[model samples]
Target: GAMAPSYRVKRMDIAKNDEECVVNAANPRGLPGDGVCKAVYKKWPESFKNSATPVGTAKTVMCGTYPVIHAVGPNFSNYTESEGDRELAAAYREVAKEVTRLGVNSVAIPLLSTGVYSGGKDRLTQSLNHLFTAMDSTDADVVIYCRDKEWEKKISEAIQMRT
Candidate 1:
């Protein structure tokens, strides 16, 4: 009951997410050469330094018209399932804290660490649980995106379980 239902489930290219701030999963080392990071890097390669940003943390960069929150989520291939869950929770929590601190009115984010980073989509419920809890601390309009129908269904089902 503590979390507001201000989150919207959406499907689209995250690069096109028009919110004032959008969360993009990035490499801990700040390479960000592919996925959402690719677009971010392509637009402003200077934003992501070659240095490491570390997992479970987030940082913001101005992306011209909107800012981007580069969140480093755990690489599931490198950790046990439980460990990945904890790191995913950390990423979401830190992202929320960043958005609240920046006072953004709206932010768009995707399920962290579940893409080419190797996290299994089955972790959707645990991921959303983390996201829901983190989002409870911010009043921003949250746009959650998943390009595939399968993930969209998983996200929808998970929201129902947020009691």
Candidate 2:
């Protein structure tokens, strides 16, 4: 199976066209409403048909029959125990829950708190691990697509080839 390339950012974008979930690259700008957003919106009116905002939060939108969640936040380094870690975790959890609620049997995620956020690889790995562990047992299949070869190796090593 070929894996899609990952982007160098800490955002998640998603779309649906009645059956499957489409993962798009996200940023604090929300959907660009053009460019990448336009590309996705063209296929999923139900999801990216709205205006974007700068709230810097996570959002779960319905695109066609699939529900897409876009997460926005600062770099992982900006997080402290009382700052953004909890919030980032909550956002990730919410998105995962939305995927489950939509009855999606499979979901794809980019490195949620990594990339431009400059989140430490180890910390981001733990965050991902936490999120995955928190999900209720389901038949859902999850895939983490890495964009760069270095990232691919790092993430794979971090997961200890368990993926």
Candidate 3:
């Protein structure tokens, strides 16, 4: 049987990618701070410029070249395990749906909550699991872009455990 479009964990920078779209871990404030969001904003401010302030969790903004799906993961002041899980899961689902709707074949996503969101390795593993599960039913080719080799190793380990 042909394999489903399984997710691929790669040690790559999403900011430098040429994929059809890239998901950005964002806050409702629309403030692109450190991590992937900073890079996205710096390179494509217009892509994120008009995005509504106070955007809710699991929202997306279509940047012409690299559409960014802003999934508000857990934050410092309002961190809750269950809520973070739900937010990250919702982000993954929303990204998958948007890509499918746009007929895009390739899309890259960062590990939500792992970076500027300050969610650590445990959160990284959990977030990836959620993302993989969400993308399992879709045909779109999903790339889990890692910030570095360390992240790549951690994400790979998580995927292996899931399988």
Candidate 4:
């Protein structure tokens, strides 16, 4: 079968979505850091075990109405081309895996590793390629929560394999 893409992109704060869970970008260490992570940092678990969340992996924490899945995308500079790409895709897959583990019906995700990690437009395009295909395997609905209208369009295009 042609595995039709199973995701959508919209300009909205993922934290405000109705999905049973929302995935956010987290530093490689799996600890609290910058970007969107900082905006919702206060709601993170009070007793987090001090540890590093490896690139391409995910960690979970309980937040009020929904669980938060933290996925760590590679810094590109820190890895070889192949490694970085693999990790990028793995991060998305990890989120899907996590949602299944948490038994959620759906999850809202954002472009990972594209912000402070310096994943440029080219890389964001690549990330969405990986994200769309990886998340396709999940039984849950996938939502791409983009904060910028331009990026939201870019994500949609990427899923369609275009600009």
TM-score of every model?
A: 0.85, 0.61, 0.82, 0.81
* 73-119: candidate 4 lDDT, tens digit per residue: 88876777788888888898888788878877777787787777754
Best by TM-score: 1
lDDT of 4 at 34: 77
Regions of model 1 farther than 4 Å from truth: 1-5, 43-46, 49-51, 119-121, 160-163
Error of 2 at 105 (Å): 0.8
| Top lDDT prediction, candidate number | 1
Better of 3 and 4 by lDDT: 4
Candidate order by decreasing TM-score: 1, 3, 4, 2
Model 3 RMSD vs true structure: 3.0
What TM-score does candidate 4 reach?
0.81
Q: In candidate 2, what residue range of length 10 has the lowest lDDT sum?
A: 1-10
lDDT of 4: 0.72
Computed on alpha carbons, the lDDT of every model, listed in order, comes to 0.77, 0.52, 0.69, 0.72
Lowest summed lDDT window (length 10), candidate 1:
1-10
Q: After superposition, how far is residue 122 of candidate 4 from its true place, in Å?
A: 3.5
How big is the positional error of residue 80 in model 1, measured in Å on the Cα after superposition? 2.2
Which runs in model 4 stand beyond 4 Å of their true positions?
1-6, 43-51, 119-121, 158-163
